[PDB]
């Protein structure tokens, strides 16, 4: 509701398609108008745009998924590795978020991706090899490492980026 | 070693189309390939076991059945048409993942019921505990005896809705979601219960064929066709 006035002109004047918000099933439907909308993949790009926004990234990051179409959005769970009973799960999300977000923002600003993380399922959007870099740093940290060591490894991956 | 040389396998393929039973709206659902009708595996018995998974929105024209895919089993071939019968029903996974929220309970039940035909069906049910309007506590849990009583009346009234239906009558009963309204009306004496659904219907055994019953589900038909002109 609060970001709808910034979502749809990137779906009507920037892109070429039309929107409706069902309050029936509380969803967003996207039609492509037949007689003047170009760009035969624009329906798929705008659908994945609002998919990123409803999945949890901010709307400027989802616009970054709309423009520059080679940014995909990987997802995985905490529960796949080390099986994480709930106290250790709290350790896991607190360890990935750091203090005042600084570790997550470090993984953001270094490997050029942007992540968001729900209570047991995290999402990384960006370009695919940087997604793999961020995913391996995250899974090392969720297996449980000193954040100084993951800062050092992040300095090396930033040196790959430079 | 040496593998194989290709010979194009779409020259021996035959196109049939799938006519759905008349317990639905618009009944041409699509087409299907099969190998060409040769001796030693004719095509009309290379078919007859295939189930297709269609969307109830595509079968009913609306979009409030955008979930709830169904299965249609091919039974009788006549004249490049595959006449189907109902074979099951299933939600998409995103629907019940979109329904499950924490701070409530899901009461789910299932019963194995034999209809007025000799089809036996395992038919499921899900229901989620609502909170009333003016409720200020954030929980709205059921006290698990309310769960046992709700699950009891769910089992009783939906095994009353089966046995009192055939397959065609049950299918026409669960298209407009009205067994859910029966569960809601019968259960609001115990707990509020938002969005009760049936969610899944499985065939277990099927009686016999009865071509007459299938053709009465669809419509008639018999052919005297062309004659060779020599």
């Amino acid at each position: 509701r609060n970001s709808w006035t910034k979502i749809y002109p990137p779906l009507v004047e920037h892109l070429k398609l039309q929107v409706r918000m069902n309050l029936k099933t509380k969803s967003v439907e996207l039609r492509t108008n037949p007689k003047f909308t170009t760009d035969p993949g624009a329906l798929q790009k705008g659908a994945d745009f609002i998919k990123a926004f409803t999945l949890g990234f901010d709307l400027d990051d989802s616009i970054a998924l709309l423009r520059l179409d080679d940014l995909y959005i990987e997802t995985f769970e905490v529960k796949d590795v080390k099986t994480l009973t709930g106290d250790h799960l709290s350790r896991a999300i607190g360890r990935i978020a750091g203090k005042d977000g600084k570790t997550k923002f470090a993984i953001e600003n270094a490997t050029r991706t942007r992540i968001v993380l729900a209570d047991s399922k995290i999402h990384i959007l960006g370009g695919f090899t940087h997604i793999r870099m961020a995913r391996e740093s995250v899974v090392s940290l969720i297996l449980g490492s000193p954040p100084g060591k993951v800062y050092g490894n992040l300095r090396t991956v930033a040196s790959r980026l430079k | 070693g040496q593998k194989k040389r290709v010979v194009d396998p779409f020259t021996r393929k035959e196109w049939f189309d799938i006519k759905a039973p008349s317990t639905f709206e618009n009944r041409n659902v699509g087409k299907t390939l099969v190998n060409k009708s040769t001796g030693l595996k004719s095509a009309s018995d290379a078919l007859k076991g295939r189930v297709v998974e269609v969307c109830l929105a595509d079968l009913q024209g609306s979009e409030d059945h955008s979930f709830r895919k169904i299965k249609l089993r091919v039974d009788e071939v006549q004249g490049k048409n595959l006449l189907t019968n109902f074979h099951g029903m299933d939600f998409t996974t995103d629907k019940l993942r979109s329904m499950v929220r924490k701070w409530q309970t899901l009461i789910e039940a299932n019963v194995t019921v034999k209809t007025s035909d000799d089809y036996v069906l395992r038919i499921f049910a899900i229901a989620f505990t609502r909170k009333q309007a003016n409720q200020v506590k954030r929980h709205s849990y059921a006290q698990s005896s309310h769960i046992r009583a709700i699950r009891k009346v769910i089992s009783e009234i939906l095994t009353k809705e089966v046995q009192g239906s055939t397959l065609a009558q049950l299918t026409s009963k669960l298209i407009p979601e009205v067994i859910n309204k029966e569960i809601e009306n019968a259960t609001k004496d115990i707990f509020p219960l938002q969005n009760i659904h049936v969610r899944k219907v499985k065939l277990l055994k099927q009686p016999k064929f009865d071509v007459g019953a299938l053709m009465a589900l669809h419509g008639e038909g018999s052919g005297e066709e062309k004659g060779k002109k020599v």
């Binding site: 995909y72 796949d80 | 299907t32």
Partner: protein, 118 residues
């Protein structure tokens, strides 16, 4: 007017599968995976490989006579990652870009429902 197949895109890590079958799923039309288009043995999951595989999928589907596909996009599922790889969205985009109409995108990865871990 459309003839509908189904897409059956299985996009794990390490590989992607673009495998159009008919409306039942019994008869296949051009299974081509990601690792058979270009193989460095590690670019099998890449969006370029998924775009190549979906592009010659759509070539053979236009050859046979299928105009549209219902998309069933799954991941490896099971007791594992449960979410598609980098090739799923690329294969879907290349299938739409290469002439085929898309309908009914749905996520049919096998959620394991009480699995066999420990």
């Amino acid at each position: 007017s459309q003839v509908f197949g189904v897409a059956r895109i299985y996009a794990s890590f390490n590989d992607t599968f673009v495998h159009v079958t008919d409306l039942s799923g019994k008869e296949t039309i051009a299974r081509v995976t990601g690792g058979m288009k270009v193989k460095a043995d590690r670019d099998e999951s890449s969006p370029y490989a998924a775009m190549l595989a979906a592009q010659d999928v759509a070539a053979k589907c236009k050859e046979v006579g299928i105009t549209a596909v219902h998309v069933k996009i799954r991941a490896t599922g099971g007791t594992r990652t449960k979410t598609p790889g980098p090739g799923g969205q690329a294969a879907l985009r290349a299938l739409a870009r290469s002439g085929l109409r898309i309908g009914r995108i749905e996520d049919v990865t096998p959620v394991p429902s009480d699995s066999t871990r420990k």
